[model samples]
Target: MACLSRIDANLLQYYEKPEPNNTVDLYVSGSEYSNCLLLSNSEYICYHFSSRSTLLTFYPLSDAYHGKTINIHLPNASMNQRYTLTIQEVEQQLLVNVILKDGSFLTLQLPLSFLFSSANTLNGEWFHLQNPYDFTVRVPHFLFYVSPQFSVVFLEDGGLLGLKKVDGVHYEPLLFNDNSYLKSLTRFFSRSSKSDYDSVISCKLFHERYLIVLTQNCHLKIWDLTSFTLIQDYDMVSQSDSDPSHFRKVEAVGEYLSLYNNTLVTLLPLENGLFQMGTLLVDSSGILTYTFQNNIPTNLSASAIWSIVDLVLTRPLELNVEASYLNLIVLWKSGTASKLQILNVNDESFKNYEWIESVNKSLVDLQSEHDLDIVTKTGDVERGFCNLKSRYGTQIFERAQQILSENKIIMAHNEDEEYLANLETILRDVKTAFNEASSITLYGDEIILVNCFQPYNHSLYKLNTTVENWFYNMHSETDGSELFKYLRTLNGFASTLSNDVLRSISKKFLDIITGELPDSMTTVEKFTDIFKNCLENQFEITNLKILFDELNSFDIPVVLNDLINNQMKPGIFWKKDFISAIKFDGFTSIISLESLHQLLSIHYRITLQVLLTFVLFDLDTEIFGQHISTLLDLHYKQFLLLNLYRQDKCLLAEVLLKDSSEFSFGVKFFNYGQLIAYIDSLNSNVYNASITENSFFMTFFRSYII
Candidate 1:
């Protein structure tokens, strides 16, 4: 079984609501809670609980924070109604409840949300995995179900089960008889092999079992494995009115069952009708094992490649591998290793495992097959992947690693070891995923990429700005910028720049950044006009230079104000010709980037300045976006921290110099790094940037590095 790493996300505030009627609470060990009130129309009933226990819980704030403890006892044998609770916050304890089940009451209470949500997700600073993956399954003639371990599995004869080892939960329903095109597209989309569900919800049925889940609403539908049919699911519920604390609405799936200890469940899923299905914990000789899927094909030879090595097999046998190979997958039924794959570690003129049709022709002769024997003393396999150091075949290693890199594949790890060990395993899988010969030095492991931040692969993005990835996105011409400039100011012969010329440049630059138009369309178009002005209308080069200079002076204070006061971000969100930038073609790319950055900065600052001024002076509520009404409900005094200045009618200015434009002045003077990071980041091609002092000043001033 492959162990996987945890995931992270940002740049988009993906507010994932949990199972209907189910809620989440922020709890920490030994914290305090205070008066909880109905926040925003009582969507959630929050409380606070604190007492030192390795176990944590979130409760109602009205229950009183730092107040005397209220002992609440949980009823015994109650399996599903409520079990796992995540610690969210250490104080005040806020919980958002999830509800609305499809008539099944298979409620599972677990901790999934961390206080990790932030504004960084607005851009692609972080990515949220949306791939619908399959965990474990009990699919058969009866009904498809999942165990609690996030394993996709099938039942075995002796009440045992066979689980499919995969990187993530599997989503297999996008198949049918008519949608032949879908199968073709599956390779592109399904290549991600991730999960859209925040929590992998599944249930397991052990030898003698009682259910472990029950949720809100009565739509419970669990499979009766013994009968091979799905039936009304139930959960542990309150049997008497005398126990208000134990007033659960449904019965636990398991009434009475037993199992071995050390059993652990990772992936849990909640399906419609509250029918439980997910991965489960398997007990084998007192060891609990997690199952994962391997995609490498193992039956070797061109046809039914078969070979059994048994001569005290202490070393891997390298048979004459002469095959022009492409795309090879291997699957081993029974092996003695955690993983294995072939590797040809130092040759470049070889197949990295895409398509080498000629196995040197000599390497893989249709008539004369090479008979090489490899064996072990006791037949104890070391690993499944072909490790180069090991004498196994190197062909599998090249193929697997190629596909692995293509798919952003990661390998699991041993908890007892460090991260590099797990990475080595992942690489081994990559090498074995394909078929090839000749030595190809893999991406070096000794070179520990400092901090090791890699570019997010745009292959699976909903929409990618990178042109090479454009094939997958399928955008229209107008969907992007139409910058026709062969040179900076000349789009061929710079006649009176027509709308077409303007449209072209705008299309190319804007599309390069935001792809299509963002909800706010003013910035790119305004900057396009600036670019057009620089091009058309008989103007001396020096005037354009002056325009640039004036722009530098004028745009800076505006951007600075937002940085200091409004916290407006100005950064390269997207860049045109990303691949060129990665290569040595960065000079021209950098110029285009500078133009794009200045264009965006000027417009972004102007918009905020206009909005803030209009809100304060013109009393325009829309300037505040949503939640303006809620904000108005509280008087300025409630939020005012400065005491020296008295409030004016609809305005509050910093009292430092009593200069009526403090907000404006504040925006001009603020040197916050985040605001600069935003400006410099706008449509930029630079990667792994360290945010230099010069760069920050440029963003602050909306000008050159000087």
Candidate 2:
């Protein structure tokens, strides 16, 4: 047995009505009716009729209206039951024909505009033709082929009658069969008796130019409608077979034939409810040939108790000559529907087992790569595993299990077991690798860096271990330059990181630095100094500037705010005299103006260091300055001290006078006489100078003015 994969079967619709009452009564009673027809490229019509209510329902097959039914009620006032009903599309209008028990017929014409109408009941003007032929044949079997100019009705006894439309709703007989010159047509159409073996069983309109007729004698005859002559006659039964009698018996049971493009499918019933299917092809040279397969695949055939009711060939409106297969929809008497894919082997380019295996292998490899990508990209291993198992694990394994269970005799000596074992082993290896790599998390952007540095030694384990220990040795063996370069690399990598991820990495790095500091370097001054050194280079690269800024701006303020609120006392340093004493004599006493200036210089250096530390840390001014007037006042006093420390008396006098309004009266520590004399000394120094001294004086003041 060939190792075949199962095709997907979808149940389009199922009827719930039981048994004989449930079966759809198509136009013909015995295997001559097709429940589906292609009205146009975009429209499909499947119809059925019930004699009890004289109702005809057309089921339009399309996704837009899958299960909708359009019912047309026939006139039942004559009390005659409908024998058969046939529908055709003539010039884009629907022509419906109904034959009654007494050989009387009713024809209805409805515009195709009602195809997509919301109303289910279609009302149309129907023309009644009561036994126009006046035949003695009761319960006449008729096939209708309707066209825009005329209509042809094929009788059971191999007679053809033509009718022409008189008006929009009326029809009259054309009497084309009475022509004496066309008497030769009787050789293909005339029947000797009602039980004649050559009587026509079915006919189909092909290309609107030829009529394809199938006779009870298993002969397919194509007749040209324009020329009114036979074009081709094909013997469906093989004459070259040794068992010609058996072939004749089988072909005699052939009942239904359907055509799509140049391909025709025939259905022949066999013993025990089984059926045989065959295909005939018409080539470009118009040579007809047939291929009769003895049996279809067992899985696709119906069970012994259920017989097939109809076989229809469905095709798209725009024909593709390159398509190497056709689709057939098979309906069973039990109301079960199935679709079969029939391959065209006439091209002699059929795909072999190796081709199928290679295609399957390629698909498996592609799917495996896709699953791996999902896991790494989303960091969701469970989701990837679920997708893999649903697609491959259950499907492949279950199929293998089924093959093993059903074909024990074949499995005893075949290589299928070995093949399945190899497949399972490959899948197991993939699962193991995926599970091992599940714990390692990385982003798409990070992979480029890893691939560049560790091209040959790449693994999830190595990549993750490197990231975890990236900064662990910064304080130990790694040089400041190496750490700085790594920081810059991380800064570039931060471009792909979201705001949350960036803040996460920043917090993680901050914890490592502050938590792992040596005891000697744990002071705030030493910490700030080391941080500034690591972040700032002489060349001044701003790559890692944003990282450090986010760290200080977002993370440091929380810590500083907490420390200030709980650790510092606000009321003790609020007094003005205490602030003045701390500034003038807190560190050293000042007896002279020059001595006071010297003390101010020392204090200014201390304040400068503290301010630089705060500036490098990117302190949040709004958070630190709110309700913190004491700190600001102290800083203002220190600014004054720094100005006085410069030793330019005029500079000091100007700054004091200009910024004096910023200070409250009690906080102005400088005496008024000292301030006045400070300005006078500068004037006397300039007056007593010579021309060279005066030039130097002017230059010195010019520096202060600019």
Candidate 3:
């Protein structure tokens, strides 16, 4: 048993290291089942164990105690029963009290006087017991001497007995009591005015320079200590709205007095009950602050408030000068059980404002990045335009373009709605710019935008340069297909632009088309090269058809625009000079005859629409140079002849002959190869039964101008 006690003493030596010492419960002899009190004032500790035999032991924290132990024993106690033992220090004097099992009061003052040094047994100043009153059930009265100031005599109701500075201690009772000592004490002080409250539970000795009494009905009555007259009566309100019945005691340390109705603790100012400082919002997460609502501190819930310490109030050295930390030493039902928690409170108003500012800054930061994507570098500006606009407002969209334009022309973007609406405005503008610029910019067999785009005249030239380069690269190949892609692209671009820009682009596009037309002719000549020397030979016309058929199967076009016009099926591919030059009599000679019919037919619709586009739109055509009428004549004659050649001769010939005019005959001269192939016979072949009139020249021309 002593070895276990020695281990408790050794545990104290290792308290300062980082690991400190794990607090362990030391087994004691009497605590098998007992009520106990351990008192500490940092200098001395007295352990009182009340079981079958009450044991009191004293230990000083200082080494001078040499781990010294003093023990005392009280007799006549049962192991199964419980008794309350209280220890107190007054005026720097210490005393220990024991309430015996028979309701006897006993007190022993420490530091026994000399001449009794030899004996361990000492006599205590015992007091007479309060004779148990028979009129009402006598509530068990325990010793209440735990004061820092006044000394409460070792007394109970109907019992016999018992402060600070000034002089020798005196027994005083300021209230009515059926005792000779109370009348004698009242003679030195004025009798206090009595109130109708049921009981006086607690008193404060000074503040009103008087005694403050808390009554059973929660009234606070102030009385002067000298005169003992009632000064102020505050009919108090209970802090907890639940019940006034659970009000057991009020614990006052200094400025704060806490009333406990069991574990429900209410902390209020010592002066009066007003608004509470804060309430506990306890839950499984631990204790949180009370959120202020309706000028009241409301607790979120109290399901986890298993136990909380008495509310403590203390002021620091710097006390109340702005920055003060309010700390609480509390116990939270944590772990799988409980652990002591130390928490502090700070000014949350400033921190809440700080969070709002952070969100505002983030919104501004996002707008910054959104603005950067437009005219965003000189790279894929199309992608930048497409990606950047819809993600931000029109203001952000214009801000970037204005940046590109060096803030010219006092640009103002009024965002009529939200960012999405403005994004559509920017998107429509981008499509316009891309469509207009793409026309003359040129393309490949793919016929898409081939260059980065810009919305200004200066950059328009750059687009032309980029596209010119694209065509130059593509033209280096043997096929002339990119040539028609170039024309169709110009048509689309011109359709979206104004007349001034259109005409300007038309002149340039026409220049390119005419210049490029020669190269296309050269390509055609190269494919037809095998025909040149063989044309004077006896090769079958059927064999020539086979060669042309093979090339057609390879996707050859009769003229460049035939393929271009087909890809632009729902759109138009045209220009002034190119449209009219195409109408002249010798034009079809350049196309391979095998595709001559198909190419002219494919172009038939577009040429008419181009003329209509030129006429109805009031588009300028000086760049076309007087060939608009020529194209119209060519289109009509080309259509009429194509019809006659593929239909019955009776109606087809009647339609052609009846419509005979300079326009009709003129188109025939353009198709000169057909001039000698079909006609009505005027000579001997008509009288011979076997001669078909339109076929007369076919064998005659074949044998000879033979």
What TM-score does each of the candidates earn? Answer: 0.17, 0.36, 0.28
Q: How far off is residue 616 in model 1, in Å?
A: 50
Candidate no. 3 TM-score: 0.28
Total clashes in model 3, counting residue pairs 3 or more apart in sequence or in different chains: 3
* Quality of model 2 by C-alpha lDDT: 0.37
| Residues 173-274 of candidate 1: C-alpha lDDT, one tens digit per residue | 322121333235456655232221111122434443222222322222233333333333332222112234433232222111111232211211111011
Return the TM-score for candidate 2, rounded to 2 decimals. Answer: 0.36
How many clashing pairs does model 2 include? 0
Root mean square deviation (Cα) for candidate 1:
28.3
In model 3, the runs with Cα more than 4 Å from the true position are: 1-42, 49-53, 62-66, 75-86, 90-92, 98-103, 112-142, 146-224, 227-302, 309-311, 317-322, 325-706
Per-residue lDDT tens digits for candidate 3, residues 469-519, read: 222223233333543443343343323333333232222222222342244
Off by over 4 Å in 1: 1-155, 158-222, 225-462, 465-706
All models, RMSD in angstroms: 28.3, 33.4, 42.9
Better of 2 and 3 by lDDT: 2
